[PDB]
Amino acid sequence: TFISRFAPDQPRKGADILVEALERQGVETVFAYPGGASMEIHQALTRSSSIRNVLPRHEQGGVFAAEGYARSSGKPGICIATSGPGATNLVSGLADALLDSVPLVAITGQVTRRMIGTDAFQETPIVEVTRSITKHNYLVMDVEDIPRIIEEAFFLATSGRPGPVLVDVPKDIQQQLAIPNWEQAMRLPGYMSRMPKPPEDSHLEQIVRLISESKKPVLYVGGGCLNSSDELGRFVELTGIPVASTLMGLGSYPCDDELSLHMLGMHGTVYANYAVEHSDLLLAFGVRFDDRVTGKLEAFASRAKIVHIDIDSAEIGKNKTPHVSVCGDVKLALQGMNKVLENRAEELKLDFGVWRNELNVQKQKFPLSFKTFGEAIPPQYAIKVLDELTDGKAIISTGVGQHQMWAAQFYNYKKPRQWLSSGGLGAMGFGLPAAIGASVANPDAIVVDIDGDGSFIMNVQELATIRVENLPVKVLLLNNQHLGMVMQWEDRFYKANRAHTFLGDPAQEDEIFPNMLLFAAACGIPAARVTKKADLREAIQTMLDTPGPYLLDVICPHQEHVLPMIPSGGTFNDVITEGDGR
Amino acid sequence: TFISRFAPDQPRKGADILVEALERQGVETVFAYPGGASMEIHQALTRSSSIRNVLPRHEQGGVFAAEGYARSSGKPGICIATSGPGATNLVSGLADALLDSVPLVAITGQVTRRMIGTDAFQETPIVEVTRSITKHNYLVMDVEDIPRIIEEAFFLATSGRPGPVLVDVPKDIQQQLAIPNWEQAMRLPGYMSRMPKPPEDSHLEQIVRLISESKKPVLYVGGGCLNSSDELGRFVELTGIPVASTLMGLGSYPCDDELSLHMLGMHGTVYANYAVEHSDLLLAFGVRFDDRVTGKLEAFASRAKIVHIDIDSAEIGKNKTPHVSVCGDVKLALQGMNKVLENRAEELKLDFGVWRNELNVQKQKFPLSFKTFGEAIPPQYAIKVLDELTDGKAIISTGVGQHQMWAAQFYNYKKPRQWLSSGGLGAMGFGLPAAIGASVANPDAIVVDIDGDGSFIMNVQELATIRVENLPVKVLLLNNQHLGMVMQWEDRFYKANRAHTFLGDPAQEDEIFPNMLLFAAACGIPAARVTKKADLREAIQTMLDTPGPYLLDVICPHQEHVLPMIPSGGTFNDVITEGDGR
Ligand SMILES: Cc1cc2nc3c(=O)[nH]c(=O)nc-3n(C[C@H](O)[C@H](O)[C@H](O)COP(=O)(O)OP(=O)(O)OC[C@H]3O[C@@H](n4cnc5c(N)ncnc54)[C@H](O)[C@@H]3O)c2cc1C
Ligand SMILES: Cc1cc2nc3c(=O)[nH]c(=O)nc-3n(C[C@H](O)[C@H](O)[C@H](O)COP(=O)(O)OP(=O)(O)OC[C@H]3O[C@@H](n4cnc5c(N)ncnc54)[C@H](O)[C@@H]3O)c2cc1C
Ligand SMILES: COc1cc(OC)nc(Oc2cccc(Oc3nc(OC)cc(OC)n3)c2C(=O)O)n1
Ligand SMILES: COc1cc(OC)nc(Oc2cccc(Oc3nc(OC)cc(OC)n3)c2C(=O)O)n1
Ligand SMILES: Cc1ncc(C[n+]2c([C@@](C)(O)OO)sc(CCOP(=O)(O)OP(=O)(O)O)c2C)c(N)n1
Ligand SMILES: Cc1ncc(C[n+]2c([C@@](C)(O)OO)sc(CCOP(=O)(O)OP(=O)(O)O)c2C)c(N)n1
Ligand SMILES: [Mg+2]
Ligand SMILES: [Mg+2]
Ligand SMILES: [Mg+2]
Ligand SMILES: [Mg+2]
Ligand SMILES: [Mg+2]
Ligand SMILES: [Mg+2]
Ligand SMILES: [Mg+2]
Ligand SMILES: [Mg+2]
Ligand SMILES: [Mg+2]
């Protein structure tokens, strides 16, 4: 039973109704940067005893923190910004949350209703701007609509295929007094009628039928399974089907497991892509057949009967056409199939040991590998050490590029929501703010941002946030002085012709530039650099053991390449397994 | 006569046609951050001998630098970004260029034409996103359209009311070979037919008629006069009409002049707003009657006959209704009126010395003023010293907030395009990147970014750009540890209740946090802090005299308030002339 801070017959500002609407949704933390058009909302926030604000240093930091909070917890992330430049600074995070299906509620102040459309001070038509990069959005045109719109926004952000919802609030509405009605019905008839039903036995029985008729089945699991860890693990017990995972799926099934093929796709393992190439049954659970995974679609799982279970009917049959499909929550489908697989266990007698052995041979002939050169630190190796000293139990966020691939390849995620990474939009500068949100949501966890030097500098101002919020964020900075992934493509496809990929100072080209230790020092954050592989284990242990935030600058030879690699639009037969920038 | 690097019968990549299209427009400098979907464009850029790239550390830095380049030079600023997160990171700069009418051409890489609409890797529907915040934009659907679209984009960005134009280029189009045709006609029939004619004598003669019948005329000049410095100065010679200027107009008429009323509006001088309040003729040249200037519209220039000259007919009669108008280039109108005023000089005998004296009394009773407390540095005073040691000849860029108002109030701009400031959107984080673009366009000028500690940290990563580009950018950081302007409004309208406006570390609240000197040190930029007013003159001289970039952290009491202040929607009779946070 909720207790308002206001008498139920007492008028209060729209801003106060908006904050109480958040309290009534269970919101505990928001990421809010104030300005003129949201001041009223900030004033109302100080009157709340149950909502904490984490002040970022840039609204892009605020929205990426909100995403970290959501991805690391399964709760919606809440960001708040002023009008105009506040709102436009959210845009990369909105697009990012929409592409990765992350639940987010973004609230923007706006000029007054009578000023809308007049090229007013700090006016942006943010509802127009963000229509194509949000799941839904709203312009509040009457203070009495605030309760319903906030309720609809959380409902839409968190139900179905999750995503971002933006709510735009004119300053005059924030100031208007009213008595809220907390019992209005949501006004979403179409969306609620198009919500998937629980899966039917008919369809689940057909999937189990297909499994029992198959000799080479592969599971293809993605971000849709992040709430299905238990059900999926049980399903693999009852079937012994080996598991390939997308970049968004990492940790749905444990990486340190004998049935795990690890990641498939452009930079997937040779054995994961082999499994899919030669499978005769493809169980695609919570995946969207993106071409970073599939390569050339006609060549992808070309001898497989394809089962697709997705909560979004628009995904089913979009790129690849399944033989069987379920439109619904993969968690319910797994539960239902598990009962069938348990009851008919002795009748079914499922054994894929011959397929599993065929894959385990590929696993032994073509494992993930890296070279050690003299005493230079291999980035791959630094991530393996971090895995060992954290016992695969850290929350890992990353930037985008080679280090992101290595954080996926060389750390064994044990649970979903340990891995926080921008996959569909691939936004640099995500890792540090995302780690801020993850640490706020999981204040007892080990939180490590595995970052690149180009990604890290983009939202470096959030080091200040980490300090004043006294968050124990660890930064494993893999520093190769380049835009590594663009550099790799220059090496393989442009004859190593460099086009603006070097991030250091060309006037002193053998100096580490910038000196990231001084960024940390500027914000009172302990830091160290490590250059020799022999010093790595101790350096990483110091970072872990030192209380509070810590930056470790890990210097890496820049000629490393992420392998394997299927070029864009290619087939398994195109996989590249050797080479680097030397 | 232009010399291609390609034979005129030789096919080359669309990327190479795009770069040569820029060369043919006279482009010398671009601000380009590479990614996968723009790599081809970056490769083609390295093949150009005439185009230099300035690599920013964040695309928001790139676009704000492009704006600095444009505002400081009168040329279009050119920024280039990859697809997806590259493109979304431009958005605040696009909206900013559209609100301040800054010419800008933004080029974004895009996924291939067949991938558009498939939720592809790093795909953003950027043409949809930016339609309402650009003057125009384009999606290139055929390599043969590149010459025409680039020509149209520069034409639209620079003609008429200038603004940003975005061009979105699919990666397959960048790779396609073709032979460009450099002689296609622009396809802009409607826009070119709606282009204003040279002003008619009928309308110019009526304006001079009104002047000669007036006893209290005021000039109200804005960003539209930035190319009319000579004509406007001559016009003031022939008429002796005193000049009030908007924040975007600063320097069109010299600040250090006896006829200058300085800035009008919410934070205008008492005498400028008085002049307008009591005028009987308002000459509104290159201004858009924004309500940061007008306050309550009915009360604004309520006894004046209003003349409005604007290049955009949509502005004429929008907010205030003129008695006379010219739709056209204010530079041509001034030239035309100057001939009339010269020929009929002895017949007209214009003398407003009685009005000018009435204003000069207001100038003496209510000048701009500040308090000095002990040995604390007044920010107002620090800007006056900078004015003196630079002889009012520096290019000044700023962030947004109190320091922005003080940079407008206490520096005497002598020419247009010395002042680079975000006025309509008011985007924090603009000052440092804008100074980068200004220094690249004016490599011999004194370039000073007068910044606040909240604005400065937002794009602090561009310190790296300044270093490797070896740009002599000076940073006068006015550091009050707060979001000053939001703090001021908290003081006057919310009983000093602080809602997330303190930027320092509350655990050690009397320490300067962060330590901006270490940000500069991280990027190899000389820096110093100054805290005592007696040390200010020397500290600023050191910054000016030390070659190359330099950061000066100027510590300021946070209780300062920008005065005067007409509250939003108010009238002259509401002006606030005293008070602060003490
Ligand atoms: C540099 C770089 C390289 C990359 N290379 C690779 C790569 O080699 N391999 C790779 O896998 N990725 C790679 N990507 C990531 C990539 O672009 C996509 O982000 C990823 O492939 C898509 O993940 P997904 O298929 O799991 O779909 P998601 O984006 O995770 O979407 C989840 C899907 O499940 C559905 N869903 C959600 N909830 C449920 C539910 N309860 N029940 C049923 N369905 C549900 C949604 O409707 C959607 O279809 C790379 C990214 C970058 C930046
Ligand atoms: C914190 C803050 C406080 C502010 N307070 C103030 C304030 O007290 N005073 C103030 O003035 N501003 C203030 N502003 C700035 C403000 O919001 C607007 O940016 C400014 O008032 C508008 O400038 P402008 O009228 O010159 O129009 P601009 O934005 O400069 O537009 C120029 C106008 O001229 C036209 N034009 C362009 N070229 C030509 C040409 N060749 N011939 C004819 N017409 C042309 C365009 O069509 C347009 O109508 C403040 C901003 C901030 C961030
Ligand atoms: C905190 O410092 C400042 C400064 C400033 O102008 C310099 N504005 C704002 O808030 C706004 C932000 C955006 C639009 C605004 O316009 C506005 N808002 C109103 O809300 C009631 C009324 C109004 O009357 C014109 N104008 C306003 C505004 O508060 O005027 N805050
Ligand atoms: C499927 O076939 C194609 C063809 C093509 O251009 C011919 N583009 C794309 O998608 C992209 C979309 C966006 C960026 C792209 O470049 C890119 N993609 C990467 O995927 C991980 C990495 C990378 O590193 C530089 N560049 C690519 C890219 O496939 O080149 N796919
Ligand atoms: C906001 C933004 N701008 C540009 C991007 C385009 N990309 C990339 C890619 C893969 O999307 O190909 O396009 S990755 C990348 C370079 C990575 O820099 P690093 O972290 O310091 O080095 P690391 O050694 O790769 O770990 C760029 C420039 C991007 N995604 N986001
Ligand atoms: C991207 C962005 N986010 C928030 C903004 C809303 N505003 C402002 C305003 C005037 O637009 O009122 O809204 S000014 C301001 C605080 C200024 O920080 P400072 O430079 O360190 O301190 P100074 O002492 O004022 O010089 C904020 C938070 C903004 N405009 N841009
Ligand atoms: Mg605002
Ligand atoms: Mg069947
Ligand atoms: Mg080793
Ligand atoms: Mg790097
Ligand atoms: Mg790209
Ligand atoms: Mg008349
Ligand atoms: Mg003094
Ligand atoms: Mg930044
Ligand atoms: Mg400040």
Residues 6 or more apart from B402 whose CB is under 8 A from it? B379, B452, B480, B484, B485, B488, B560, B561, B562
Measured CA to CA, the distance from residue B63 to residue B88 in angstroms comes to 11
Ligand 4 centroid from CA A486, angstroms: 11
Q: Quick one: DSSP state of residue A344?
A: T
CB contact, 8 Å: A30 with chain B? no
CA atoms within 13 A on the CB side of B502: 17
Which pair of tokens denotes residue A195? 């919500």
Unique residue bearing structure tokens 């996926």: A408
Parallel, antiparallel, or unpaired for β A12-13 and A177-178? antiparallel
Rounded to 5 degrees, what are φ and ψ at B33? -110, 120
**What is the Cα–Cα distance from B106 to B90, expressed in whole angstroms?**
8
What's the CA gap between B302 and B233, in Å, rounded? 27
Closest CA to A77 of A88, A66, A86, A85: A66
Length of chain B: 582
Rounded Cα distance, A435 and B234, in Å:
60
**How many other C-beta atoms are found inside a 10 Å radius of the C-beta of residue A567?**
14
DSSP codes, A112-134: -TTTTTS--TT---HHHHHGGGS
3 state DSSP class of B437: helix
- Rg of the Cα trace of chain B? 25
Residues of A with Cβ-Cβ distance to B319 under 8 angstroms: 118
Beta bridge partners of B474: B448, B550
The backbone torsions φ and ψ at residue A491, rounded to the nearest 5 degrees and listed phi first, read -60, -50
DSSP-assigned letter for residue B509: T
Inter-residue contact A395 to A420 (CB < 8 Å): yes
At residue B326, the 3 state secondary structure works out as strand
Read off the tokens for A527: 């830091």
Min Cα distance B360 → chain A (Å) is 31
H or E stretch covering A109: strand A104-110
- Whether residue A394 contacts residue A446, with contact meaning beta carbons closer than 8 Å, is answered with yes
* Distance between first and last Cα of chain B: 66
C-alpha distance across the termini of chain A, in Å: 66
Cβ(B93)–Cβ(B66) below 8 Å:
yes
Q: How many residues does chain A have?
A: 582
| DSSP per-residue string spanning A53-95 | E---SSHHHHHHHHHHHHHTTSSPEEEEE-STHHHHTTHHHHH
- State the SS3 of B213-257: CCCCEEEEECHHHCCCHHHHHHHHHHHCCCEEECCCCCCCCCCCC
* Cβ neighbour number for residue B50 with a 10 Å cutoff: 13
Buried b (16+ CB within 10 A) or exposed e, A102-113: bbbbbbbbbbbe
SS3 A334: helix
What tokens were used for B181? 């045709």
| Alpha-carbon separation of residue A172 from A37, A484, B206 (angstroms) | 9, 48, 42
> Are A63 and A14 in contact, with CB atoms under 8 Å apart?
no
What element of type H or E holds B356?
Answer: helix B353-365
Q: Distance, in angstroms, between B447 CA and closest chain A CA? A: 22
Please state the separation of Cα B341 from the chain's center in Å: 32
Q: Which two tokens stand for residue B174?
A: 């960048």
Q: Whose CA is nearest to atom 49 of ligand 2?
A: B288
Rounded Cα gap, residues A109 and A120, in angstroms: 13
Label residues A149-178 b or e (16+ Cβ within 10 Å = b).
bbbbbbbbbbebbbbbbbbbbbbbbbebeb
DSSP-assigned letters across all residues of B119-188: --TT---HHHHHGGGSSEEEE--SGGGHHHHHHHHHHHHHSSS--EEEEEEEHHHHH-EE---TTPPP--
B36 lines ligand 4 (CB under 6 A): yes
A192: Cβ contacts below 8 Å, ≥ 6 apart? A186
Closest CA to A278 of A575, A577, A572: A572
Distance CA B405, CA B565 (A): 11
User: Helices in A106-244 by DSSP H: which ranges?
Assistant: 126-130, 146-158, 171-175, 189-193, 201-212, 229-239
DSSP one-letter code for A312: -
Whether B18 and B150 have beta carbons less than 8 Å apart is answered as yes
How many Cβ atoms sit within 10 Å of the Cβ of residue B153? 26
- CA-based nearest residue in chain A for residue B47: A499
Q: Which helix (H) or strand (E) holds B22?
A: helix B14-24
Residues with Cβ within 8 Å of residue A560, at least 6 apart in sequence: A370, A378, A379, A380, A402, A480, A484, A580, A581
Q: What is the C-alpha separation between B345 and B208, in angstroms, rounded? A: 11
C-alpha dist (Å) from residue B164 to A83, A95, A557, B98, B283: 20, 22, 41, 6, 28
Q: Tokens 């011959």 — which residue?
A: A354
Is A101:A158 a contact under the CB 8 Å cutoff?
A: no
B122 catalytic? Reply is yes
Residue A21 CA, chain-centre distance (Å), reads 27
- Helix or strand holding residue A397 (H, E): strand A395-398
Consecutive H or E run containing B310: strand B305-310
The tally of CA atoms less than 13 A away on the side-chain side of residue B183 is 1
Residue whose C-alpha is closest to residue A210's, from A324, A370, A128? A324
d(CA B392, CA B255): 9
Interface test with B, best of A126, A128, A422, A428 (most B CBs within 10 A): A428
Number of H helices, E strands in chain B: 24, 20
Chain A: residue whose CA lies nearest to B318: A118
Give Dmax (Cα) for chain B. Answer: 75
A499: number of Cβ within 10 Å: 24
**A77, β-bridge pairs:** A104
The Cα B246–Cα B288 span in angstroms is 10
Full strand arrangement of the beta sheet holding B395-398? B419-420, B395-398, B447-452, B473-479, B550-555, B527-530
Residues 6+ apart with CB under 8 A from A400: A421, A422, A426, A427, A428, A430, A452, A455, A485, B85
**B245 forms bridges with which residues in the sheet?**
B221, B263
Selection from B33, B34, B30 nearest residue B21 by Cα: B30
CB contact under 8 A, B133 and A115: no
Does residue B324 sit in helix, strand or coil? strand
> Residue B457: left (phi > 0), alpha (psi -120 to 50), or beta?
alpha
Distance between CA A209 and CA A213 in Å, rounded?
6
Whether residue A221 contacts residue A355, with contact meaning beta carbons closer than 8 Å, is answered with no
List helix spans (H) across A176-290. 189-193, 201-212, 229-239, 270-278
Residue B580: name the closest of B411, B382, B375, B379 by CA.
Answer: B379
> Computed from CA positions of residues B481, B485, B491, B497, in that sequence, does the dihedral angle turn out positive or negative?
negative
**Is the separation of the CB atoms in B69 and B87 below 8 Å?**
no
A514: preceding bond cis by omega (within 30 degrees): yes
B198 alpha carbon, distance to own chain's centre: 26
8 A C-beta contact, residue B64 and residue B434 = yes
Using CA atoms of A506, A508, A513, A518 in order, give the dihedral in degrees to the nearest 10: -150
Residue B524 zone, left/alpha/beta (φ > 0; ψ -120 to 50; rest): left
Residue A50 to chain B, least CA–CA distance (Å): 15
B42 touches chain A (CB under 8 A): yes
B191 vs A542: CA distance, rounded Å = 65
Ligand 7 ion local residues (Cβ < 5 A): A 35-37, 82-83, 122
H-run or E-run covering A24: helix A14-24
- Return the half-sphere exposure (C-beta side, CA atoms, 13 A cut-off) of residue A451: 29
For A170, which DSSP code? E
Distance between CA atoms of A304 and A276, rounded to whole angstroms? 8
- Which amino acid would we find at residue B7? A
Instruction: For residues A177 and A144, give the distance between their C-alpha atoms in angstroms, rounded to a whole number.
Output: 10
Closest to B531 measured CA to CA, from B556, B551, B514, B550: B556
Domains of chain A are 12-193 (3.40.50.970), 201-365 (3.40.50.1220), 379-562 (3.40.50.970)
Q: What is the DSSP letter of A159?
A: S
Question: Relative to the alpha carbon of A206, which ligand is closest?
Answer: 8
CB B140 within 8 A of CB B200: no
User: For residues A100 and A434, is the Cβ–Cβ distance under 8 A?
Assistant: no
Q: How many CA atoms lie within 13 A of B192 on its CB side?
A: 7
- Please tell me if the CB atom of residue B251 comes closer than 6 angstroms to any atom of ligand 2: no
Q: Name which residue sits closest to atom 3 of ligand 5, judged by CA.
A: B86
3-state class of B363 per DSSP? helix
Q: C-alpha A55: how far from its chain's center?
A: 22
A292 carries a ligand binding annotation: yes
Number of C-beta neighbours around residue A366 at 10 A: 16
| Amino acid making up residue B89 | N
What single DSSP character describes residue A574?
Answer: G
Residue in B25, B122, B184, B206 annotated catalytic: B122
Residues 6 or more apart in contact with residue B367 via CB below 8 angstroms: B269, B271
Which of B133, B486, B501 faces A124 most closely, judged by CB atoms? B133
Closest by Cα among B92, B71, B43 to A129: B92
**Separation CA A296–CA A281 (nearest Å):** 19
> Which among A181, A174, A183 has a CA at the least distance from the CA of A45?
A174
Q: Give the position of tokens 């000629």.
A: A559
Binding residue positions of B: 59, 101, 122, 135, 161, 171, 223, 246-247, 264-267, 286-292, 310-311, 329-330, 402-403, 423-424, 426-428, 453-455, 480-485, 489, 568
SS3 B482: strand
Residues 6 or more apart whose Cβ sits within 8 Å of residue B52: B28, B29, B30
Neighbours of B534 (CB within 10 A): 9
Whether the link from the prior residue into B189 is cis, omega within 30° of 0, is no
Ligand 5 neighbours by CB, cut-off 6 Å: A 399-403, 426-429, 452-455, 480, 483-486; B 33-36, 82, 85-86, 89, 122
Structure tokens at B357: 């004296």
A496 touches chain B (CB under 8 A): no
* Integer CA distances (angstroms), A102 to A94, A223, B145, in order: 9, 10, 38
A378/A409 Cα distance (integer angstroms): 13
DSSP B302: T
Mutate to test the pocket of ligand 5, among A428, A488, A561, A565 (most ligand atoms within 8 A of CB): A428
For the CA atoms of B48, B54, B58, B61, the dihedral, rounded to the nearest 10 degrees, stands at -120
- Reduced to 3 states, what is the DSSP secondary structure of residue B542? helix
Please tell me the distance from the alpha carbon of residue B295 to that of residue B319, in angstroms, as a whole number. 11
DSSP state letters, A489-508: HHHHHSTT--SS-B-S-GGG
Structure tokens at A433: 């703010």
- Token digits for A447? 């939180």
Residue B459's Cβ-count burial label (10 Å; 0-12, 13-18, 19+) is: buried
Q: How far is the CA of A448 from the centre of ligand 9 (A)?
A: 22
Which one, of A402, A418, A397, A413, lies nearest residue A475 by Cα?
A397
Type of residue numbered A91? V
